[model samples]
Target: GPGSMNILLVCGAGMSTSMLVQRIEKYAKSKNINATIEAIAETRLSEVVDRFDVVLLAPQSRFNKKRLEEITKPKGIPIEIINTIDYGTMNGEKVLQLAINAFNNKSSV
Candidate 1:
């Protein structure tokens, strides 16, 4: 796990996030990004939260933003709310970069 990262993307339902996961996975592979990413319903987040290095919340899940930060804080995992435009357009490359930046920033903090 030295150079690997695990990212969790959460949404109201797992459906839309799953689509984004596929896109990001494909993009990550093409770019040789060393990360495992998954999508999960917000309800199941706590059960698996401890397993990931970073968490990305869908724009629609903004309501849970503060709560998620509290959940991730103890683990020192970074949590970011994805941009609506980028997420809406399924911009895998941008989202991947966003995750990278977020993780890096948190690691340094």
Candidate 2:
């Protein structure tokens, strides 16, 4: 209830994760959650990674985990790879839970 949830999902391209982003976006709004959720292409993280509270990587992006970590971590944005089963099923609430879990235990908020 304090503020918006900023979620970033990284992958090579849209693919089915685009649909997953859609599911989460709709789910957030259905419950009146204030947030921004997106699955961005891998290339854009160079300039776009700063905005999110949490960065959730799609399973396919696991190949470049270290590279992504180098960027998001130094900036203090939490990073996590989404669960494959959840990604495959497009589990919005579960994935949403994952995103929140990334930052929930850290700060004083």
Candidate 3:
């Protein structure tokens, strides 16, 4: 429970999310953060949205943020659009912090 988080990364195609997943996992391990991260095409989000603590969207798929909110909000799940620069640079530390913040903020709410 404490210090544990599940993350779902979504993008227009699975490729981008997949790359980010490796970075995220590596970063999390380096920081001793316990997290389970998965990458999926946006189209598959609805199928597994309920299983994660946070949903992270690739900048390219941020257009679906509103629709994603509609689905996750009702379930009390937090979804964040990753910063384009951080994502493009594969800034795992920043992206992971973004998701961590979402989870933190969600629980507080």
Candidate 4:
């Protein structure tokens, strides 16, 4: 079965990510990749991080990355900090590349 990527993006309010995320969805759809991409605030991380296949952290969120990792690691979930340049430009495809790389690298399955 072809699996869909359920990715969670977290930043301050996820406002910036909100815009970029749509692009990701568009790219994924265009490529015929099944995906469910959602963006949420850092505050909501703990509550929902476990539901996704991968978690991406916006630049500023790196300050709390360690603390957040503590939460994701236990569940065996893969997470990464989104690069500044790619994120600043809101390059959805680039962000998707990074996310897919992160997921594949730690893909325990």
Query: Weakest 10 consecutive residues, lDDT, candidate 1?
Result: 11-20
State every prediction's TM-score relative to the real structure.
0.76, 0.76, 0.75, 0.76
lDDT of each: 0.75, 0.73, 0.75, 0.75
* lDDT of candidate 1 over 43-102, digit per residue (tens): 788777777777788776445876776666775667777887888888887878888788
TM-score, candidate 1, is 0.76
Cα error, residue 45 of model 1, in Å, equals 1.4
Model 4 poorest ten-residue lDDT run: 10-19
TM-score of 2: 0.76
Residue-by-residue lDDT tens digits, candidate 4, 1-109: 9676677888646564366877887898799886777778768876776567778887865457777767667766777777778888889898788788887787532
Q: Which whole-number lDDT from 0 to 100 does residue 76 have in model 1?
A: 63
The deviation in Å at residue 83 for candidate 3 is 1.7
Deviating ranges (above 4 Å) for candidate 4: 12-17, 61-63, 70-76, 107-109
Off by over 4 Å in 1: 12-17, 70-76, 107-109
lDDT of model 3, residue 6: 84
**Residue 12 error, candidate 2, Å:** 5.0
